[PDB]
Design a protein around this nucleic acid. Structure first.
Lengths: 159, 50, 107, 80, 49, 189, 139, 165, 435, 52, 48, 65
RNA sequence: UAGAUGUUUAAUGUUAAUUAAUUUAUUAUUUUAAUAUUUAAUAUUUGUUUAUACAAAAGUAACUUUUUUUGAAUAUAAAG
RNA sequence: UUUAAUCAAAGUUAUUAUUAAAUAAUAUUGAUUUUGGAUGAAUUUAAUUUUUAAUUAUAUUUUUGAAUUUUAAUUUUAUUAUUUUGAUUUAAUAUUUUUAAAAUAUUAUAUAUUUUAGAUUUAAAUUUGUUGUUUUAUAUUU
């Protein structure tokens, strides 16, 4: 909170123009050949211990997987459901605090909302050899925790 | 950043700023602990308005 | 915030422990009790004990009264705690708070 | 499992609960007597099926002695 | 505690009193006022075990 | 009150006589009476292994019946069916079996594709015997040219999902039904 | 009434188990540092993050911890803002920076002050005749 | 063991003779209610079990739930009162509380009329020597309260001291 | 020290907030020749008082009857004691409409006890330790770690350290041999001497500062929270969370005292700010402890007094974290009643012997005076007790006329039984005590 | 205060959107086979331990 | 749901919040009733 | 015996009595999976010891989703 | 320079009553469990050529679709 | 192209979390799926002993050889405990961490402050005829 935060490569100091990670899958033929022919690595096909036992994840692994899919909790939905397609709602806080737009769709189990023109991003569409790389702009699901309704008379906050 | 209940404009000025709410610590807990504290921001308004 | 190293005085924490041998004994509650004096026999082993009970054995029934000074009484009737019209007994003293109740034990 | 848990030993009285076991032939180990039929029976019922002359005849006390085991102290009122 | 003194060798009447004279004992009628020092109550004559 | 044991030998210090050993473990201190846990820790009674050697637990559970009670007749509410009916072919769970069978005979589409095979192969459940299958082709699909049925009780297939959680496909059986006539499937081509 | 054993008066945090201390002095829990931010003895003190060690907090901002760890998704909702307390109101003004001038220090938008550096530097390097290239994990 | 059961329900309010060692030198306004509803709970939650106990216990010993048996059932029929001292009951002491509440509401009614007399009797417009500050200045945020007493503006003191005239 | 010799202040002013020093003719914000950590003027923490506190006038209140509003006296007559202020304390009471209805004396014993720090400390030192969650201060011990019992390796042949059964504080799984469990701690004791005396010297400091204000009634006309917050704006109680807030000792009106609050106010009294609400008494119960010798070894909770002071009393931590004290006149009467028999027993004999002359000892029980105005609850219990003063008539165990026959008893000692018996007209009335 | 749920939301539901408890526990175990196994909507899983 | 932007109401997955725990819970399980419970639920304190 | 530390990825020697190991061929070090234990992660599927579990998720959110 | 005749820590330190520059006095030589060296330019590894019998227990890191019998049910590879 | 050879590493890394521990007096036939399977003995744990029952004092007294104190108000509330407020408050808070930055003194041998010289027991404990015993420490952070 004290000093500015810019692109992680500019004031940090190690500025590269193209980082290459060799541990990826694409670069397998680049590493599996760099090492000597005399560097034999066994267990290429079979492991030693029994791997069809059921096991947990790393500590840090759950921590990542609990934040992605939180609705797997019991009753993650909002206890009364008051957001519906066609509602007249305005955002409140966060990015673009104060825009007005009508709901078009609701993702109920996630406590979020698809609202016109608010929080619009470019849904890139990777494609196989038939179509090229396609990009498509599309507004995104935003949480209902940060939107309130445009009262058809007072046009203010209204539960 | 404080002045008696009537001298509320004369604080150290700021920039684009909108009073969000009062920092009632239970705003962090689950929504049933924010269904309480619902009107406690409404009620507190006219207490600092003359 | 210091260590009363015996025969050396108060010492800083983190200080020097080279000279705190008998202090590491006192903290452990370990009591030698001057027992290296084997040579000189104390009055303990040579003191004939009278009275298979003891010198002041307060056996049941021993009439050991709790002393009440008379001058403590004459000071509480002119202070105003005791009304000299009435037959002053043990009830008033306790209630006039002349004497506490820890003093009164049978008899 | 137990089909038909047996009834208490001597629930002949209509108001007061049966005496502890052993006294009437059973297993020593409780100083009370509990007839579930007596408790579940409500009060207006328990007083209905008796008369005052009879109520004073099963509240009857033998306190220093047992009413069932002759010559024996009331093992409702003993230490154990 | 520089305040207190050494506990004496033989008991004293204020020690035998203060021990059972706290607030917490105020209702312990028996054993109050040194009942354990008096000669026992003359037990009942119809007493038996 | 309990009065703590005492360990400061000195002027008296003669534990050799009346002093009974109080080195006996200090029950008074741990008096918090909730059992510790056994030092060789008994594993959970759930079977963790999932490979091809997944054995079947013989030990008969407790809640197993108390759920098959309430699923043949409401257990805590409705009264038990009379045993003459309970042990009868009219006991509903057995009734719904002589007139409403529920099996799953999944023929591998891979077997009879464009090729022509006189021995189709079936992924029949594990309860169904050889005869029970023939009587299932002849009565529901009217396939009445079986010669011999073989049996390869195969364990269901394992796999790990994207996270990496072990899952399995319900066990089945492979029954190489020797047909009389070469049957194929005319894949539209 | 023997006077109260107020060792750490409040509200300095509890001690850490010295060779000295009464049977009543409640030290810090074994394996738990007493100065929260001093994880690593030379850890510099955080800037605007004070963990509300103590009773329930009177006013709890979003950037201050309370029975929690830091979390940029929750402890800092929008980094372009900067929450204060004016007249007991949790207000969130603009974030600025103390950029330089002729000899004065005037605050400019902290989102604008960082849009330059993210570009004026990124546009500085790309016009430098090199090709920086780090290959990670050479076996 | 010995824990002084003869002191539990014997406080004036409902918060004494109860170990609340788990306190906190600042209880939030949400955490004060819960502390009241707490201390209010373990007095009813306490006895509402000691009533269920002794009533379900008499039902098993063969008595009336209250504790009456055969004899003290007859006496009430004969018209004799059974207990020595009939202590004032719910409807009794919850009725006395409608006395000392009803005369005070009438005493505090007439006190409106007696206060107006001795306030519209001595009703100056210039305050007496108390309006001096030769010793210590006045509290101007208080003068806004004495102002409704007189007509002359007390709420305006010069920057110079006020001799108190 | 004096490291960091550069790099602290950037060598430039800020944009429009930094001012250089003009000179010694103008005055800076905050400057004062006294060390003040909480610097306050009469605008930020305005004392609600007639005057302004000063070294000239001993207290910011009237010391003499101002004749433009009626004068009330205290309920109980005032006698001056050791720590008293030795001067009249006439304090103007207020009305819920922010007015000044009448003026009223204040008992020097309670409100004029000149403060001392070496005793208000005992009030704070008691609180800062009593107001403390003990059960949270629970750590494991050596014998709660669940590890092997055997030495984790033979101590000799191994190239290791001479250690067995590694479950100790040196290891990242062990625990302190003598750790801090709740019941090891201390709930300090606090008697009535040093609790009252401390508290009475806090309601005096709250006067000497001028933050004291007596109120007629604290009832809200409706049980909402709006009527609470609106009551503070008109009466002027800054109660925002940051600005200094009020302290509400509550006791009902003057004519209708009540030890409990008003359901209207109590329900509106709940607001997340610098507001408090305390019981209208300064005295407290006598400290006892039953588990004084760890007899009940199943206990949880600190050693010491098992009768702690409840949090909603008047303490020294919220006496200062809430600046303004707001007493109701009902609360006043109860303070003067419960402290009455206290100040009288705290007088010398030669002076205690003049009280029966000066109308201090007019006993409402001997009828020498009509009964004093009592609290709504404590009068209700006096109407009940007076009501049943008759049911004990026909029995020889009457509490109001005990020992009716101590004039006719004829005590007779017999030497066959250990008995001194008494006869009332030849009929034995002693009772052989059952066992 | 009977509002507090007298059957916990953590308990695996009856899976019967019809409106009645589907076989209670009896049948969640039949449908947990559908959970510990693979659901019906399930498309191409990514991992290298694949069913076939 | 992002691509088209359609609505979806019931979750597409039959979560088991017990993770094979209900295999040990009798089908007649239902929590008891607790009188004089603790907490500010029965009093909806929207004021603070 | 037992000269280094007690973790399986330690530095000095050990013994099978004091610190009995499970024979783990090649696992990940404290600083991450080097390019040797990933030659399996893209061919074998999981690290060759069998004990670690193949969290292949964020690749699935890379390609398929 | 500097109190003094030398071994019981200094603290409202972003008032645990604060909210944008705190730039927090803070670290136990060794018994702890993690990492990092040094031995280490290393010791040891290094795959161009030999002569084939069957059971069981033993594993199940494991897959299977493809011919078990004319027995119904069951099971057909793998160490210590 | 010449480098006579040498000489240095300082002070920053993303993107995801609400779990532990103590506290609370309102449950309870054993935690990890469908018994026997012959219709029968498989699925039996019972007995007057500080026991998942846990005790408000300092006196007296057994050999003073260590032992140690009695209903508190009799069915009255020291009770074996969780819930439609991330249950409540307090106390504690972490890797996958994967991150990483520059040419001053010398140049024929005594160890930092650059005027070039001078200056040198590694510490702690241990040893009280051994201060100088014959152990310990690679370093870093907890």
């Amino acid at each position: 909170l004290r000093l500015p935060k810019v692109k992680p490569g500019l004031l940090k100091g190690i500025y590269t123009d193209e980082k290459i990670d060799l541990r990826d899958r694409e670069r397998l033929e680049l590493v599996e050949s760099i090492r000597h022919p005399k560097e034999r690595d066994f267990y290429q096909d079979h492991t030693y211990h029994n791997q069809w036992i059921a096991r947990d994840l790393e500590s840090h692994q759950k921590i990542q997987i609990a934040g992605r899919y939180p609705y797997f909790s019991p009753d993650y939905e909002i206890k009364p459901w008051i957001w519906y397609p066609g509602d007249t709602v305005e955002v409140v806080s966060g990015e673009g605090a104060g825009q007005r737009g009508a709901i078009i769709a609701v993702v109920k189990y996630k406590n979020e909302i698809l609202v016109q023109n608010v929080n619009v991003q470019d849904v890139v569409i990777p494609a196989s050899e038939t179509r090229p790389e396609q990009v498509v702009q599309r507004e995104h699901p935003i949480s209902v925790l940060r939107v309130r309704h445009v009262d058809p008379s007072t046009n203010q906050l209204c539960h | 950043l404080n002045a008696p209940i009537g001298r509320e404009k004369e604080v150290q000025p700021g920039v684009n700023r909108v009073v969000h709410d009062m920092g009632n610590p239970y705003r962090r807990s689950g929504v049933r602990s924010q269904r309480m504290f619902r009107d406690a921001e409404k009620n507190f308004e006219k207490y600092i308005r003359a | 915030s210091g260590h009363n190293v015996i025969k050396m005085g108060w010492m800083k924490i983190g200080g020097s422990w080279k000279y705190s041998r008998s202090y590491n004994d006192a903290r452990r509650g370990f009591a030698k009790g001057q027992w290296q004096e084997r040579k000189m026999t104390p009055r303990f082993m040579l003191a004939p004990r009278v009275s298979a009970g003891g010198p002041r054995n307060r056996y049941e029934g021993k009439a050991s009264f709790s002393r009440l000074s008379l001058s403590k009484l004459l000071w509480a009737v002119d202070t105003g705690r005791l009304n000299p019209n009435e037959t002053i007994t043990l009830y008033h003293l306790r209630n006039a708070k002349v004497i506490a109740d820890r003093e009164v034990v049978w008899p | 499992v137990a089909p038909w848990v047996p009834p208490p030993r001597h629930d002949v009285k209509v108001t007061m609960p049966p005496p502890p076991g052993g006294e009437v032939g059973g297993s020593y180990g409780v100083s009370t007597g509990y007839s579930d039929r007596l408790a579940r029976t409500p009060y207006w019922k328990r007083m209905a099926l008796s008369t005052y002359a009879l109520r004073m005849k099963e509240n009857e006390t033998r306190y220093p002695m047992s009413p069932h085991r002759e010559g024996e102290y009331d093992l409702r009122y003993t230490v154990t | 505690n520089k305040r207190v003194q050494p506990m004496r060798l033989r008991a004293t009447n204020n020690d035998i009193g203060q021990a059972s004279s706290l607030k917490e004992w105020e209702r312990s009628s028996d054993r109050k006022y040194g009942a354990a020092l008096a000669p026992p109550k003359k037990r009942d004559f119809e007493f038996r075990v | 009150r309990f009065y703590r044991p005492l360990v400061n030998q000195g002027i008296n210090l003669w534990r050799s006589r009346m002093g009974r050993l109080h080195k006996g473990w200090t029950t008074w201190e741990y008096n918090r009476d909730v059992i510790p846990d056994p030092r060789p820790f008994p594993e959970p009674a759930v079977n963790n292994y999932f490979g091809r050697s997944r054995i079947w637990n013989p030990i008969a559970g407790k809640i197993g019946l108390v759920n098959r009670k309430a699923e043949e007749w409401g257990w805590p509410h409705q009264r038990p069916p009379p045993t003459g009916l309970r042990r009868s072919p009219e006991y509903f769970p057995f009734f719904f079996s002589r007139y409403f069978p529920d099996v799953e005979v999944r023929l591998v589409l891979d077997s009879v594709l464009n090729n022509e095979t006189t021995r189709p192969i079936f992924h029949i459940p594990q309860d169904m015997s050889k005869q029970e299958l023939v009587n299932y082709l002849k009565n529901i699909y009217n396939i009445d040219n079986v010669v011999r049925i073989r049996v390869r009780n195969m364990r269901g297939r394992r796999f790990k999902n994207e996270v990496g959680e072990i899952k399995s496909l319900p066990d089945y059986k492979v029954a190489v039904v020797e047909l009389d006539s070469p049957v194929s499937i005319v894949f539209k081509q | 009434p023997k006077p109260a054993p107020r060792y750490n008066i409040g509200l300095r945090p509890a001690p850490k188990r010295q060779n000295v201390g009464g049977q009543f002095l409640a030290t810090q829990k074994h394996y738990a540092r007493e100065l929260w931010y001093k994880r690593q003895y030379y850890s510099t003190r955080p800037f605007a993050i004070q963990k509300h060690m103590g009773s329930t907090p009177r006013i709890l901002l979003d950037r201050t911890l309370w029975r929690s760890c830091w979390l940029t998704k929750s402890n800092l909702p929008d980094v372009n803002r900067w929450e204060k307390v004016v007249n007991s109101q949790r207000v969130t003004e603009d974030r600025w920076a103390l950029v330089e001038e002729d000899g004065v220090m005037y605050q400019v938008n902290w989102k604008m002050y960082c849009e330059r550096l993210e570009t004026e530097l990124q546009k500085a390097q790309d016009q430098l005749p090199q090709y920086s290239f780090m290959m990670k994990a050479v076996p | 063991g010995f824990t002084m059961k003869y002191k539990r329900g014997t406080g004036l309010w409902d918060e004494d003779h109860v170990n609340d060692f788990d306190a906190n030198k600042y209880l939030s306004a949400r955490s004060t209610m819960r502390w009241y509803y707490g201390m209010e709970r373990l007095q009813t939650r306490n006895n509402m079990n000691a009533r269920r106990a002794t009533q379900s216990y008499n039902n098993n010993m063969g008595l009336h739930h209250s504790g009456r048996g055969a004899f003290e059932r007859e006496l009430e029929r004969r018209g004799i009162q059974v207990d020595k001292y009939p202590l004032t009951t719910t409807t009794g002491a919850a009725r006395v509380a409608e006395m000392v509440l009803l005369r005070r509401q009438e005493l505090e009614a007439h006190a409106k009329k007696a206060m107006e007399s001795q306030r519209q009797a001595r009703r100056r417009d210039a305050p007496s020597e108390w309006y001096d500050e030769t010793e210590g200045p006045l509290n101007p945020r208080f003068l806004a309260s004495m102002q409704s007493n007189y007509t002359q503006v007390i709420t305006e003191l010069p920057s110079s001291p006020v001799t108190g005239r | 020290y004096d490291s960091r010799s550069s790099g602290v202040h950037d060598v430039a002013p800020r944009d429009g907030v930094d001012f250089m020093y003009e000179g010694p003719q103008q005055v800076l914000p905050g400057a004062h020749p006294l060390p003040l950590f909480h610097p306050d003027n009469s605008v930020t923490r305005p004392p609600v008082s007639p005057y302004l506190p000063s070294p000239q006038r001993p207290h910011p209140y009237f010391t003499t009857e101002l004749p433009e509003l009626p004068h009330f006296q205290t309920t109980r007559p005032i006698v001056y004691t050791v720590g008293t202020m030795k001067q009249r304390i006439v304090a103007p009471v207020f009305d819920l409409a922010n007015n000044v209805t009448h003026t009223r004396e204040l008992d020097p014993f309670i409100f004029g006890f000149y403060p001392e720090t070496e005793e208000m400390a005992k009030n704070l030192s008691y609180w800062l330790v009593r107001c403390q969650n003990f059960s949270s201060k629970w750590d494991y011990e050596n014998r709660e770690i669940w590890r092997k019992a055997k030495k984790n390796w033979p101590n000799t042949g191994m190239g290791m350290a001479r250690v067995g059964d590694r479950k100790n504080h040196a290891h990242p799984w062990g625990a302190h041999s003598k750790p801090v469990k709740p019941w090891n701690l201390l709930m300090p004791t606090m008697d009535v001497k040093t609790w009252s005396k401390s508290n009475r010297m806090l309601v005096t400091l709250k006067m000497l500062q001028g933050k004291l204000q007596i109120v007629e009634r604290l009832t809200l006309p409706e049980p909402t929270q709006e009527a609470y917050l609106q009551l503070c704006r008109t009466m002027g109680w800054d109660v925002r969370h940051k600005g200094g807030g009020a302290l509400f000792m509550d006791g009902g009106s003057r004519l209708t005292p009540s030890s409990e609050y008003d359901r209207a106010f109590f329900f509106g009294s709940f607001f997340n700010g610098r507001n408090k609400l305390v019981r209208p008494t300064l005295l407290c119960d006598e400290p006892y402890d039953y588990n004084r010798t760890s007899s009940k070894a199943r206990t949880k909770g600190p050693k010491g007094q098992k009768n702690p002071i409840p949090i909603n009393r008047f303490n020294a931590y919220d006496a200062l974290t809430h600046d303004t004290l707001i007493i109701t006149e009902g609360a006043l009467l109860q303070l003067e009643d419960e402290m009455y028999t206290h100040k009288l027993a705290m007088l010398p004999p030669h002076i205690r012997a003049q009280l029966p002359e000066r109308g201090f000892l007019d006993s409402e029980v001997l009828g020498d005076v009509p009964p004093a105005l009592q609290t709504v609850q404590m009068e209700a219990a006096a109407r009940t007790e007076e009501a049943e003063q008759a049911m004990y008539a026909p029995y020889y165990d009457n509490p109001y006329h005990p020992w009716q026959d101590e004039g006719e008893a004829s005590y007779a000692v017999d030497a066959v039984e250990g008995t001194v018996q008494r006869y009332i007209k030849s009929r034995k009335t002693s009772w052989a005590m059952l066992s | 205060d009977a509002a507090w749920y007298e059957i916990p939301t953590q308990f695996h539901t009856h899976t019967y959107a019809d409106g009645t408890p589907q076989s209670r526990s009896a049948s969640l175990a039949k449908a947990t086979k559908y959970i510990h196994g693979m659901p019906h909507n399930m498309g191409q899983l990514y991992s290298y331990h694949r069913p076939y | 749901v992002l691509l088209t932007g359609r609505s979806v109401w019931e979750s597409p997955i039959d979560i088991d919040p017990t993770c094979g725990g209900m295999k040990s819970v009798p089908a007649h399980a239902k929590k008891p009733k607790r009188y004089m419970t603790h907490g500010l639920a029965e009093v909806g304190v929207t004021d603070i | 015996y037992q000269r280094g530390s007690w973790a399986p990825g330690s530095k000095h020697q050990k013994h099978m009595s004091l610190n009995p190991t499970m024979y783990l061929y090649r696992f990940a070090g404290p600083h991450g999976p080097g390019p040797y234990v990933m030659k399996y992660w893209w061919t074998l599927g999981c690290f060759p010891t069998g004990i670690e579990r193949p969290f292949r998720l964020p690749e699935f959110l890379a390609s398929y989703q």
